[PDB]
Design an enzyme around this catalytic site. Structure first.
Site, PDB file in Angstrom:
ATOM      1  N   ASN A   1       1.924  10.192   7.630  1.00 47.53           N
ATOM      2  CA  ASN A   1       3.299   9.723   7.521  1.00 47.53           C
ATOM      3  C   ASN A   1       4.250  10.488   8.436  1.00 47.53           C
ATOM      4  O   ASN A   1       5.379  10.802   8.047  1.00 47.53           O
ATOM      5  CB  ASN A   1       3.797   9.877   6.088  1.00 47.53           C
ATOM      6  CG  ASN A   1       3.113   8.935   5.111  1.00 47.53           C
ATOM      7  OD1 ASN A   1       2.332   8.063   5.496  1.00 47.53           O
ATOM      8  ND2 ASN A   1       3.399   9.124   3.824  1.00 47.53           N
TER       9      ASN A   1
ATOM     10  N   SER B   1      -0.783   6.602   2.513  1.00 47.26           N
ATOM     11  CA  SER B   1      -1.603   6.769   1.316  1.00 47.26           C
ATOM     12  C   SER B   1      -1.699   5.485   0.506  1.00 47.26           C
ATOM     13  O   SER B   1      -2.636   5.337  -0.277  1.00 47.26           O
ATOM     14  CB  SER B   1      -1.010   7.826   0.375  1.00 47.26           C
ATOM     15  OG  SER B   1      -1.133   9.103   0.941  1.00 47.26           O
TER      16      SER B   1
ATOM     17  N   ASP C   1      -8.453  12.510  -4.497  1.00 48.44           N
ATOM     18  CA  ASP C   1      -6.996  12.601  -4.584  1.00 48.44           C
ATOM     19  C   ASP C   1      -6.608  13.551  -5.708  1.00 48.44           C
ATOM     20  O   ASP C   1      -7.292  14.555  -5.924  1.00 48.44           O
ATOM     21  CB  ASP C   1      -6.434  11.186  -4.815  1.00 48.44           C
ATOM     22  CG  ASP C   1      -5.072  11.003  -4.253  1.00 48.44           C
ATOM     23  OD1 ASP C   1      -4.913  10.345  -3.186  1.00 48.44           O
ATOM     24  OD2 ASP C   1      -4.122  11.574  -4.823  1.00 48.44           O
TER      25      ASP C   1
ATOM     26  N   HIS D   1      -0.190  10.345  -7.977  1.00 52.49           N
ATOM     27  CA  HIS D   1      -0.581   9.805  -6.673  1.00 52.49           C
ATOM     28  C   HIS D   1      -1.986   9.208  -6.704  1.00 52.49           C
ATOM     29  O   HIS D   1      -2.210   8.083  -6.232  1.00 52.49           O
ATOM     30  CB  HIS D   1      -0.512  10.935  -5.664  1.00 52.49           C
ATOM     31  CG  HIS D   1      -0.670  10.513  -4.236  1.00 52.49           C
ATOM     32  ND1 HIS D   1      -1.889  10.558  -3.596  1.00 52.49           N
ATOM     33  CD2 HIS D   1       0.227  10.074  -3.314  1.00 52.49           C
ATOM     34  CE1 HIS D   1      -1.736  10.191  -2.331  1.00 52.49           C
ATOM     35  NE2 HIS D   1      -0.468   9.867  -2.145  1.00 52.49           N
TER      36      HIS D   1
END
Ligand SMILES: [Ca+2]
Ligand SMILES: [Ca+2]
Length: 279
Positions: free
Chosen positions: A161, A224, A39, A69
């Site tokens: 998403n 996520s 990530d 994130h």
């Protein structure tokens, strides 16, 4: 063990029903497993990681998580207060820049890196990789995720998403990994969650409280956020010896809460990750 007033998602994965507030989990808590969070990096110094997080690779100028994130996802895997597997080891692989973006070749390199790097780490209960990322379909990204899974890593990836069929996104569309959709605290498919035949499982994804950079916390939403619930649950179940990296996704699907979710299109699994914990 029981964590009172836990984040709703942790409560949800330890209940057959929505709306509870305690996270019930075996005290082994993923100890002895390792989860690579691929990530934006991990702010390892965050007190919530308790020393159990470290950066192992960056593809950018610094290993610092300048976005948050990756710190948030890592906290859902394994932070003390916000984590599924509160005693796992966390390894950060920064394939995304501080804007949250990353070239596919860099993401592939980071997957290949984990497949090799795990051979230098002592992870006696096994290795998981959490990939809260993706873009459009790419056979090379899919192949990289398939290799990582084949190498002996339980790979969990976000469905995406886009409120669309995950067949058009990668690594979501790679069949051999564990593709994770998102749900909300009322057991609806999250409004943004992809769906489709390739999804293996759903996890809590709407309004997920976790760690953030600057030693902080915040709630955010996405597949996520659902992915590290499943990666953390895999680590937890591997530590319990109930499954292995090769079989954890199938085990999680076969022990999931079934039919609890709403707004699941016909042909998408109605399975919500569940730890089946019995004191
Ligand atoms: Ca139920
Ligand atoms: Ca799959």
């Amino acid at each position: 063990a029981a964590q009172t007033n836990a984040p709703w998602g942790l409560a949800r994965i330890s209940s057959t029903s929505p709306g509870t507030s305690t996270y019930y989990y075996d005290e082994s808590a993923g100890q002895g497993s390792c989860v690579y969070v691929i990530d934006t990096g991990i702010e390892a110094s965050h007190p919530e990681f308790e020393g159990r997080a470290q950066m192992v690779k960056t593809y950018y100028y610094s290993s610092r998580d300048g976005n948050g994130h990756g710190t948030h996802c890592a906290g859902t895997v394994g932070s003390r207060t916000y984590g599924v597997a509160k005693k796992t080891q966390l390894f950060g692989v920064k394939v995304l820049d501080d804007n949250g973006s990353g070239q596919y070749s860099t993401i592939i390199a980071g997957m290949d890196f984990v497949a090799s790097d795990k051979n230098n780490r002592n992870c006696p209960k096994g290795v998981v990789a959490s990939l809260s990322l993706g873009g459009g379909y790419s056979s090379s990204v899919n192949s990289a995720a398939a290799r990582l899974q084949s190498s002996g890593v339980m790979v969990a990836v976000a469905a995406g998403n886009n409120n669309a069929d995950a067949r058009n996104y990668s690594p979501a569309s790679e069949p051999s990994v564990c593709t994770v959709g998102a749900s909300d605290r009322y057991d609806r498919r999250s409004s943004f969650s992809n769906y489709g035949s390739v999804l293996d499982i759903f996890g809590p994804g709407t309004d997920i409280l976790s760690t953030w950079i600057g030693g902080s916390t915040r709630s955010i939403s996405g597949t996520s956020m659902a992915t590290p619930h499943v990666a953390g649950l895999a680590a937890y179940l591997m530590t319990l010896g109930k499954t292995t990296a090769a079989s954890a996704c199938r085990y999680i699907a076969d022990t999931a809460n079934k039919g609890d979710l709403s707004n699941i299109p016909f042909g998408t699994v109605n399975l919500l990750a569940y730890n089946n914990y019995q004191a």
